[PDB]
Design a protein around this motif. Structure first.
Motif, mmCIF file in Angstrom:
data_model
loop_
_atom_site.group_PDB
_atom_site.id
_atom_site.type_symbol
_atom_site.label_atom_id
_atom_site.label_comp_id
_atom_site.label_asym_id
_atom_site.label_seq_id
_atom_site.Cartn_x
_atom_site.Cartn_y
_atom_site.Cartn_z
ATOM 1 N N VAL A 45 -35.523 9.516 9.950
ATOM 2 C CA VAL A 45 -34.659 8.913 8.733
ATOM 3 C C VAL A 45 -35.363 8.632 7.181
ATOM 4 O O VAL A 45 -36.905 8.972 7.315
ATOM 5 C CB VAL A 45 -34.373 7.390 8.864
ATOM 6 C CG1 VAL A 45 -33.705 6.868 7.989
ATOM 7 C CG2 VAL A 45 -34.827 6.446 10.410
ATOM 8 N N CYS A 46 -34.083 9.078 6.064
ATOM 9 C CA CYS A 46 -34.769 10.258 5.505
ATOM 10 C C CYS A 46 -33.811 9.005 3.997
ATOM 11 O O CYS A 46 -32.257 8.897 4.530
ATOM 12 C CB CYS A 46 -34.459 11.158 4.658
ATOM 13 S SG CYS A 46 -34.652 12.694 3.412
ATOM 14 N N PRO A 47 -34.619 8.470 3.192
ATOM 15 C CA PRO A 47 -33.704 8.534 2.188
ATOM 16 C C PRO A 47 -32.312 8.441 2.326
ATOM 17 O O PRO A 47 -31.598 7.953 1.327
ATOM 18 C CB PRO A 47 -34.880 8.075 0.561
ATOM 19 C CG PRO A 47 -35.491 8.759 1.157
ATOM 20 C CD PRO A 47 -35.759 9.313 2.676
ATOM 21 N N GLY A 66 -27.823 11.691 10.256
ATOM 22 C CA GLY A 66 -29.385 12.473 10.350
ATOM 23 C C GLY A 66 -29.043 13.813 10.057
ATOM 24 O O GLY A 66 -28.746 14.799 10.315
ATOM 25 N N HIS A 67 -30.887 14.409 9.820
ATOM 26 C CA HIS A 67 -30.614 15.615 9.134
ATOM 27 C C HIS A 67 -32.013 16.437 9.044
ATOM 28 O O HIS A 67 -32.449 17.366 8.907
ATOM 29 C CB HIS A 67 -30.089 16.168 7.752
ATOM 30 C CG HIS A 67 -30.413 15.525 6.575
ATOM 31 N ND1 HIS A 67 -31.198 13.569 6.269
ATOM 32 C CD2 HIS A 67 -31.624 15.608 5.564
ATOM 33 C CE1 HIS A 67 -31.504 13.841 5.456
ATOM 34 N NE2 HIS A 67 -32.021 14.704 4.773
ATOM 35 N N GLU A 68 -33.315 15.598 9.447
ATOM 36 C CA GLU A 68 -34.886 15.999 9.693
ATOM 37 C C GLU A 68 -34.622 16.370 11.106
ATOM 38 O O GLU A 68 -34.976 14.793 11.774
ATOM 39 C CB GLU A 68 -35.026 14.871 8.688
ATOM 40 C CG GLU A 68 -37.035 15.022 8.802
ATOM 41 C CD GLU A 68 -37.683 14.676 8.401
ATOM 42 O OE1 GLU A 68 -37.558 15.214 6.834
ATOM 43 O OE2 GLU A 68 -38.971 13.813 8.344
ATOM 44 N N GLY A 177 -37.896 20.432 8.788
ATOM 45 C CA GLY A 177 -36.150 20.094 8.328
ATOM 46 C C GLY A 177 -36.178 19.019 7.496
ATOM 47 O O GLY A 177 -34.916 19.497 6.993
ATOM 48 N N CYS A 178 -36.989 18.836 6.568
ATOM 49 C CA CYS A 178 -36.231 18.593 5.331
ATOM 50 C C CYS A 178 -37.446 17.821 4.457
ATOM 51 O O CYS A 178 -37.947 19.026 3.246
ATOM 52 C CB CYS A 178 -35.618 16.971 5.598
ATOM 53 S SG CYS A 178 -34.804 16.697 3.736
ATOM 54 N N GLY A 179 -37.817 17.070 5.328
ATOM 55 C CA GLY A 179 -39.465 16.570 3.935
ATOM 56 C C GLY A 179 -40.571 17.034 3.542
ATOM 57 O O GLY A 179 -40.472 17.015 2.140
HETATM 58 ZN ZN LIG Z 1 -33.846 14.667 3.900
#
Ligand SMILES: [Zn+2]
Ligand SMILES: NC(=O)C1=CN([C@@H]2O[C@H](COP(=O)(O)OP(=O)(O)OC[C@H]3O[C@@H](n4cnc5c(N)ncnc54)[C@H](O)[C@@H]3O)[C@@H](O)[C@H]2O)C=CC1
Ligand SMILES: NC(=O)C1=CN([C@@H]2O[C@H](COP(=O)(O)OP(=O)(O)OC[C@H]3O[C@@H](n4cnc5c(N)ncnc54)[C@H](O)[C@@H]3O)[C@@H](O)[C@H]2O)C=CC1
Ligand SMILES: [Zn+2]
Ligand SMILES: [Zn+2]
Ligand SMILES: [Zn+2]
Lengths: 376, 373
Positions: A45-47, A66-68, A177-179
């Motif tokens: 989970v990302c902010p 969801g994206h990561e 994937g993101c962070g």
């Molecule tokens: Zn993100």
């Protein structure tokens, strides 16, 4: 489950704003031309996902957030040959079509595929033909930033994913994937940190910590970590920070303190928090003549800069997915992890069943975690 | 080391114009030079000094853009002698501090006030003044004070130039031309084949167009709310011209549409709240660059989304030039016709008529008025 057929699986849907996520059973259609269907193995989970549930923000419903994440290819659409069942992959929000003016320039990592430049969080809400692959209780469901990882099976555009090493640990590489990528790259590509320099990082979450890793790998000799929650310092020090400061326990503005410690200010600053006070301080604490400020996080819509400050030598810029040309760079970051160039393990504080997703959201909202791994 | 009696323009208090008075100029001390002013211009900055809304010190001798000759030098000086031609300036290069040694900036340790530089360098190195009038000591201005037949400056604030220079034209190198020319070349870093946009067409903006052309830009868009400024713009390199007051859509939207996405480099040589916002908006995504030169307001507001999507911002100080080392080179380029300064001078007036030159500028009727003795 098999090719050409609609699949029925678990997922988490947001029916409307300011509400918790519901676990439902949905139908995921098969991939069309230039599309790929993935089986999601692990996700976080990302902010940015939570930000979507905030009533004071702009968003669309109902949607699959969801994206990561990281996973495995189930089937591919007609005319696709760069992917096949069995391959391990990592999708992302920043596309790379390789066939446009922006993709050709070494000065940016944006792509012509993007359409909304005022509200990117609501762009890529449907596939190219302008239709959805999700259905639940008759109603059609929106996609999220071209990924939608809160479902066992999802469908993405070929321009939004890359194949990675066959022996990669999907329960950890999912952070790419993101962070991790966003913070690490912000320091290396966007700010362009150099050997022997002094740096300052505001915000010590997954992004800020990855920025510290990046600064160390780039060779900085001094790194100042700033956060209003002192419990985040020990982990920052284990990753490279040499000094720590809590704005809440100081008598003078934190920027005035930084300026004193360095006798003028730092060479590079990165804001990985994004509040009105962090943005102002990030500029204030840099040296005159050649000081540089890079924006990473942003919770507010604008920032105010005094004119005399840029006239005297300070400059300002910002990052988008760490400045990485996505399709080409993601595979390389995965190889670096294999060779132990950096440790993604320290970024993980919790592990839980996908069913408990709402608990992971609470933990993050309470600042009691960095990243929580969810598995189906 | 005799004391010289001459005329000069003094501002006694805020809210009132300059007064022509007879003063006394003391001889130069160590690391100082006494200059005989041959030609001086008025710049917007000199005028701000008397506006009650702005911060300033009184009583003072204003002026900072000029060219002239060496009258006498202080004890121990050897790089200057009577008769040499020289050009002073507000951006020092003392060459005995840490900043001068760095190739990353053109600032200098001689500076002290970084929130209001217009009131810095108001006295000499030893903290005393060289001017006197009716028993009162008078302040200096930004290390130059050119509104006087004779003045004294620190060796860190001037440079010797070509013996055959035309002082009635090279005086512009003292501030206006160098700042605009350098903003394009050193600060914005304009490249061959690029597209640029310049807001404000006074001396500074015109010099920025000259700089864009010399750097190799393929397209140069000129913007001003006063249409009479266009003929000179085209004579110097402008390929397209736009007047905000004659367009229905905001000017930044017109620029974006005429270029199918925006420009590579923009330069604000006006400095209003509207120009600063437009200068950022009219740049392309991914790598668009905005450089601040003019500044009528104290702040500027930037949207978070714009920086995240690739746009960047920076600003210039005397065009980014290491003063003492570059001014002589700029004089040589003019001698060799690399560019032509004669087009920037639109009027000439006797020094005693300084107040008429000021009124001319406040009506948008001029570029630069040279004052002679
Ligand atoms: Zn993100
Ligand atoms: N530019 C881009 O492409 C990307 C931007 N982001 C953004 O970056 C930001 C950070 O992400 P995460 O690390 O995952 O979030 P997070 O919530 O874990 O990090 C926030 C941290 O900043 C601290 N903080 C809050 N107010 C503060 C203040 N006044 N002074 C100092 N510290 C303060 C918090 O205590 C916390 O430790 C988010 O806003 C996110 O949306 C994430 C990915 C990519
Ligand atoms: N950063 C530095 O080191 C330096 C800064 N400057 C500054 O640069 C500025 C310009 O100097 P000059 O050319 O000599 O002044 P000027 O007054 O002759 O030039 C201003 C021009 O901009 C135009 N203008 C005003 N509002 C406009 C708008 N909304 N849109 C388009 N055009 C507009 C005017 O019609 C005029 O032609 C001043 O603010 C000055 O203090 C000057 C030298 C060095
Ligand atoms: Zn592309
Ligand atoms: Zn000036
Ligand atoms: Zn110096």
């Amino acid at each position: 489950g098999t090719q050409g057929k609609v699949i029925k699986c678990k997922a988490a849907i947001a029916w409307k704003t300011g509400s918790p996520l519901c676990i439902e059973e949905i139908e995921v259609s098969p991939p069309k031309a230039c599309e790929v269907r993935i089986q999601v193995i692990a996700t976080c989970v990302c902010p940015t996902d939570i930000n979507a549930t905030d009533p004071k923000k702009k968003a669309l419903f109902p949607v699959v957030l969801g994206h990561e994440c990281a996973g495995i290819v189930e089937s591919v659409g007609p005319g696709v040959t760069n992917f096949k069942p069995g391959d391990k992959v990592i999708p992302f929000f920043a596309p790379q079509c390789k066939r446009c003016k922006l993709c050709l320039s070494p000065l940016t990592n944006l792509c012509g595929k993007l359409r909304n430049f005022k509200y990117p969080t609501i762009d890529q809400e449907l596939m190219e033909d302008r239709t959805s692959r999700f259905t639940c209780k008759g109603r059609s469901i929106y996609h999220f930033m071209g990924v939608s990882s809160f479902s066992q099976y999802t469908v993405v555009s070929e321009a939004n994913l890359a194949r990675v090493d066959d022996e990669a640990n999907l329960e950890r590489v999912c952070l790419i994937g993101c962070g991790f990528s966003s913070g690490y790259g912000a320091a290396i590509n966007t700010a362009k940190v150099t050997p022997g320099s002094t740096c300052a990082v505001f915000g010590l979450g997954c992004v800020g910590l990855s920025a510290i890793i990046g600064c160390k790998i780039a060779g900085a000799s001094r790194i100042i970590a700033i956060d209003i929650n002192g419990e985040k310092f020990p982990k920052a020090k284990a990753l490279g920070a040499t000094d720590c400061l809590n704005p809440r326990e100081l008598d003078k503005p934190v920027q005035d303190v930084i300026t004193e410690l360095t006798a003028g200010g730092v060479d590079y600053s990165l804001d990985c928090a994004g509040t009105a006070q962090t943005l102002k301080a990030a500029v204030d604490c840099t040296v005159l003549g050649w000081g540089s400020c890079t924006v990473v996080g942003a919770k507010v819509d604008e920032m105010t800069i005094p004119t005399v400050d840029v006239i005297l030598g300070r400059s300002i810029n910002g990052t988008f997915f760490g400045g990485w040309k996505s399709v080409d760079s993601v595979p390389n970051l995965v190889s670096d992890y294999k060779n132990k160039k950096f440790d993604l393990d320290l970024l993980v504080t919790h592990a839980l069943p996908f069913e408990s997703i709402n608990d992971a959201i609470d933990l993050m909202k309470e600042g009691k975690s960095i990243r929580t791994i969810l598995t189906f």
